[PDB]
Curated annotation (Swiss-Prot), chains A, B:
The gene is HSPD1. It comes from Homo sapiens (Human). It is an enzyme of class 5 (isomerase). PROSITE patterns: CHAPERONINS_CPN60. It catalyses: ATP + H2O + a folded polypeptide = ADP + phosphate + an unfolded polypeptide. This is 60 kDa heat shock protein, mitochondrial. Belongs to the chaperonin (HSP60) family. The modification N6-succinyllysine is found at residues 7, 58, 101, 109, 167, 178, 181, 194, 212, 226, 277, 328, 372, 457. Disulfide bonds: none annotated. The modification Phosphoserine is found at residues 43, 46, 386, 464. ATP binds at residues 51, 87-91, 416, 496.
Length: 527, 527, 75
């Protein structure tokens, strides 16, 4: 209903291209090992310093609405590349700018831009097939460290710590990046089963040094219900006292009367016992209690289906652990004595539940729970001096984690834009259906040299000469922009994940070739 | 109430024609196989790229209120054409602009524009009769694929997938378009009775690979009331246990004591049973449960009228399914053992209820029930790399389904604007009553060349020469604007639904010939 | 580079191939081919080339010594 302004043809296309060019010019200065950073003003507090392409793209919106349409479309390109790959957003931005520019240049009266877009998509399918032919799988941890080093802007300590994390918790294990309070990066490996619920009352401490509850070879009592009565807690304590064995009660809550009994027996006679709340929220509580029961070889009490009561407790429905550590804010069970076969069947149940979930929230819960059963999790604390430096480093650590996961998934290709340069002869063998598809294939052929050219231009050299020498060279040779030398790139560890490259190219090509079919732009009149 | 500006005669008509011309110029760039796209800025997020004429029309409003009146009238033309036919909105827009322009040019002191409008409508009736004479019914699935391909801007894959859907679920079956998460379009055929209610308890899972409940040759217990007591659930379980047969309960809800009994008997002794909530939200829920009762051969318990009781359940009161899958979010019943004549009677009851339906929302529910009872539904998932591409493609897929349904309903004619071109000799034989009616007939006669001329102009050639060559050629010969050649259009599959053509012409003609009768325009003074 | 740029090709690649070529080989920008320039008659007067270089170098290298610019305030 609002009044609109309608622009036609080449003027509207040039305004949208101005928006695309401004955003991609801001993004392109961050590409490669000699890329620079972008400072983005925040409404609150300190500005943000970043080398991340989608972060730069998302922070830019233009007053002119025709320019802002092109800026929003390349924002979509960078966001989609970040969503499905976690890396390569700058490459996708510069590819999208190249395709938009070449498509806008090739529009005349006789051109059919929809068929040009068909030719563009056919060329991208050919390039993706050639990239999959060129890809090789990751086999060594050295390749892992090289991928993580390249994706972290040449930082070898980040690559080494990510490779160590994947050596310790597995290549598909749970790795989590968070803030460090020190100057240096730290890797913490959380083994066993550790959850973020501490002890319930501050009267179960037997070790002064950490103000912590310390037991070894202890019974574990699992409860899906709150333990508030005498009759629901006394027989388990009788079993624990008749065996001279410590007891760890993991329940929904132990409050009031059972808590009073526990603290009275702990303080007066010296009964070894501790009470921890049940981690989780809702069905995750029941799932994690069940998993602790399989891992310790115990049984969950007070449940919906089997309905085991806390009055008839046996010595065989209490789990056994080799060590338990309880602190103020967390607890951890170590060396659970559960049946190993039941642990493997529960793990397979977790994997088959992963295979049918797609909400990306309970998927992370299932990954957490699988990691707790199998090998533990890894936490990378990112060190630094200030919050701005820590955040800038965490962007690259997240990029390197995502790229390493991608390289474990789909393999590796040559870095430095060389993998798209070696796909040009695949395009040279295509037979286009008509002239418009030939135009589209040639657009993609010219666009394939753009990442290597941008990396070389950011290094202060003539990018066209670098790309020409790479093309004239043997297939293993490419430009090391950091060293400024033509090297064997696999031997020097300058490699990229295949999935990142194909994702960036496909995401750029679809949106940019849709944009180049436009003839009329309708905007709202700014009030 | 507010202050008004009043304009008279030719100046007001010129301003209204400026509004009409602006909207039609924006819409007309999208017409034909060489049409281009329009980018519409959205208030939120990404802009919308479209080739749909009514979408372009509805997005344009003008600050000048005199121009905005003409813009809203051609918006009405496009919206009415989309509501009746679902396609041909660009054709309707350009026809309306042509009629408005010719009628505005033919207004003098002695002219009677109301009688000119009467001549216009008489000419349109003659053209519609000639179109119905020229129409031929659709007999082959090849014609289905050709219609869907033409309506989807030459996309042969969309035509093939729509033809496959109409092969599998019928030409009058239920076909729904939704988003795909992949690159490519997918066709999913849902057969039998599948509804979006999963299991009530996770403990019913007996197949871990899909985390789902799988049963073969199972009893079905259907209740219109909630099952919550022991006595309402025990006898059916006793019948299921005595017959050595799985039980599937479909109820309003299963909670409380009955759910506890179900999960206890499932976990302890391994009783084959599963409980599912009933689909629907009222009378539709009762109708769907009744439909499942006829489909499986069972009876609905706890209904309002017959009032069957869950205490006295007979084995013949339970339906029989050959197979059933219950997942987390859906359930599906396969090979029900209901009486075929009862299923037929229910089907005719549903068809006659459709015949007496006047809401178009209950029509969807009745068609869904008919599809679940007879042939199943088809889901077209539209693929793409981004939301803007997916939305642009879904516009064309929806257009192709609407055009294919229209072609099934009322037949086909020559595409490319040639069907209206061949109706000119029908206008050449009319005898007008007076000079004003002769003017109106001649307006329609000039207007009948506009769609072919616009299609040829978008292809970059001289439209008038193309139209003259078509009119001088044989009746089967038209212009392939994609190939740029004069061809046999039926043989080349360039065809249109007759309903779309006549709807576009009638909807354009009524509004534009009403608009050309205006002498005074009253607008509000802009505040 | 400027002659190659005006011909619609990439000037740096052209200059690189000329510098990698034999001393008689240069780029016919009208035909878009690497040719023998004396045989094809693409030749220049020596005086014109040296005059253009000297007259550009003197003024431009004097201009690049400037720290302060004084202009009149526009009325
Ligand atoms: N020493 C190097 N020599 C040549 N190319 C290199 C070198 N180090 C990294 N590269 C290349 O630089 C690219 C990485 O650039 P950068 O990380 O700045 O952008 P991106 O991955 O496209 O985007 P973003 O990280 O912002 O999401 C990859 O193609 C990588 O192979
Ligand atoms: N190859 C072709 N040669 C000639 N005419 C063609 C060809 N393909 C399609 N057409 C014609 O183009 C017209 C379809 O144009 P288009 O779908 O852009 O507009 P529309 O149906 O009027 O409106 P909308 O789809 O926006 O609601 C039909 O008349 C169809 O017969
Ligand atoms: K970057
Ligand atoms: K159209
Ligand atoms: Mg990167
Ligand atoms: Mg159409």
């Amino acid at each position: 209903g609002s009044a609109k302004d309608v622009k036609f043809g080449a003027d509207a296309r040039a305004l949208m291209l101005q928006g695309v060019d401004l955003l991609a010019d801001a993004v392109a200065v961050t590409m490669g090992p000699k890329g620079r950073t972008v400072i983005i003003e925040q409404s609150w507090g300190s500005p943000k310093v970043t080398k991340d392409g989608v972060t730069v793209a998302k922070s830019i919106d233009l007053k002119d609405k025709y320019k802002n349409i092109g800026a929003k479309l390349v924002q979509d390109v960078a966001n989609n590349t970040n969503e499905e790959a976690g890396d390569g957003t700058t490459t996708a931005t510069v590819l999208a700018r190249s395709i938009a520019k070449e498509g806008f240049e090739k529009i005349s009266k006789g051109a059919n831009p929809v068929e040009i877009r068909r030719g563009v998509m056919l060329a991208v399918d050919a390039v993706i097939a050639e990239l999959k032919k060129q890809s090789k799988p990751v086999t060594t941890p050295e390749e892992i460290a090289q991928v993580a080093t390249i994706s972290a802007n040449g930082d070898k300590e980040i690559g080494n710590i990510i490779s160590d994390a994947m050596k310790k918790v597995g290549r598909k294990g749970v790795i989590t990046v968070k803030d460090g309070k020190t100057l240096n990066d730290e890797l913490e490996i959380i083994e066993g089963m550790k959850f973020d619920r501490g002890y319930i009352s501050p009267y179960f401490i037997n070790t002064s040094k950490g103000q912590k509850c310390e037991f070894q070879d202890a019974y574990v009592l699992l409860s899906e219900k709150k333990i508030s009565s005498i009759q629901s807690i006394v027989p388990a304590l009788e079993i624990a006292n008749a065996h001279r064995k410590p007891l760890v009660i993991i329940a929904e809550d132990v409050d009031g009367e059972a808590l009073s009994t526990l603290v009275l027996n702990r303080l007066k006679v010296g009964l070894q016992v501790v009470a921890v709340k049940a981690p989780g929220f809702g069905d995750n509580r029941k799932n994690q209690l069940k998993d602790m029961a399989i891992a310790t070889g115990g049984a969950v009490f007070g449940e919906e289906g089997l309905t085991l009561n806390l009055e008839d407790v046996q010595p065989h429905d209490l789990g056994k652990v080799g060590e338990v550590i309880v602190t103020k804010d967390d607890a951890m069970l170590l060396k659970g004595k559960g049946d190993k076969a039941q642990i493997e069947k529960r793990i397979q149940e977790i994997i088959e539940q992963l295979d049918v979930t797609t909400s990306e929230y309970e998927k992370e819960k299932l990954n957490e729970r699988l990691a707790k059963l199998s090998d533990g999790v890894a936490v990378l604390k990112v060190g630094g001096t200030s919050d701005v430096e820590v955040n800038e480093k965490k962007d690259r650590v997240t990029d390197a984690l995502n790229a390493t996961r991608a390289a474990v998934e789909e393999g590796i290709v040559l870095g430095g834009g060389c993998a798209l340069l070696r796909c040009i002869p695949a395009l040279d063998s295509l037979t286009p259906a008509n002239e418009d598809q030939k135009i589209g294939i040639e657009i993609i052929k010219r666009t394939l040299k753009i990442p290597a050219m941008t990396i070389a231009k950011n290094a202060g050299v003539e990018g066209s000469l670098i790309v020409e020498k790479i093309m004239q060279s043997s297939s293993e040779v490419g430009y090391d922009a950091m060293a400024g030398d033509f090297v064997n790139m696999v031997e020097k560890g300058i490699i990229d994940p295949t999935k990142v490259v194909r994702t960036a190219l496909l995401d750029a090509a679809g949106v940019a070739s849709l944009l180049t079919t436009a003839e009329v732009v309708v905007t709202e009149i700014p009030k």
